[PDB]
Amino acid sequence: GKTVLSCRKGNGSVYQVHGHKRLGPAKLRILDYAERHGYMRGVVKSIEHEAGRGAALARVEFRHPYKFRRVKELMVAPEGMFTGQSVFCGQKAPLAIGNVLPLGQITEGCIVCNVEAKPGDRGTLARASGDYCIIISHNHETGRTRLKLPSGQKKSVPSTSRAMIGIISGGGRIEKPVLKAGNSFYRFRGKRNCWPKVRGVARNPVEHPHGGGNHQHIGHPSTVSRHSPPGQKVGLIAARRTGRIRGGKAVKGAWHPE
């Protein structure tokens, strides 16, 4: 046999990110002394689009806390961010859309985005267009905050981890039918080399477990074990269930009783 396509992509090569024309990683500003004790006020200078990202990006200009210069951070703009808006970031920042506050300072039931999974990680959750997290509750005894992630899972994080008030801009993108293969071609131009997609049954058996046969068919069950080696782990990986879901979509992902 030969290496399966899913294994080949792990080598990198021609399947890596088309990072040219991207503006750079989008993040909150560094959790410095000013954020931990007071606040830093910035100004939104531009709202920009980056190839491969549905959400709009905001360039926010701050003064350097220690030097005579400016910083010009780049963040994922929440819905409603506008040029000239004042962005407040810190412990003492007021509760308003676009401001960055510690989670412990944000009232329960609020809608947040750009949530730090770890304090100081500069935003790792609720970043894709139209997504948000919901603050469930605060637990001061352990200093944790419970959140509802966009996928539906509930996650506890330290209350010093920051979040941005609002929802990610650009929501509703997936509601418009593509209607053309060419539009998908342009969609994936800025992301990576992963389109078009050839079905495994259309390939030959040398390069895919589903290949071959005098009829186009998978001759074995497509649910494969979690422990299957690469090259054999294709199809529905470790599926707890299959078939059309009826009577309610359960929350996907791993089960965390905590």
């Binding site: 709009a56 009232t107 418009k176």
Partner: protein, 89 residues
């Protein structure tokens, strides 16, 4: 005079892609190409310049909101909630 009975802007696609996919795309396409009210400057001059990016031809303000409309209903709900929670504090 009217040039199409019901297709409207989708008539550039001819007979392709199906009626229902055309209808669903049309609602969002009209919205994304339409002029939207600007709360600043009080004009109907907001136009999209990229997915999620809107610039007002009147006051030149740029606002990040909505893939195909200036503001999504979820954002309106979030705006009221944040204002209410801010008053509560």
């Amino acid at each position: 005079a009217k040039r199409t009975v019901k297709m409207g802007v989708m008539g550039r696609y001819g007979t392709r892609y199906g009626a229902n996919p055309r209808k669903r795309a049309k609602k969002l396409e009209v919205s994304q190409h339409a002029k939207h009210f600007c709360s600043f400057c009080g004009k109907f001059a907001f136009r999209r310049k990229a997915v999620g990016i809107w610039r007002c031809d009147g006051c030149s303000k740029t606002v990040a909101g909505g893939a195909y409309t200036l503001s999504t209903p979820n954002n309106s709900t979030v705006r009221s909630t944040v204002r209410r929670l801010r008053e509560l504090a």
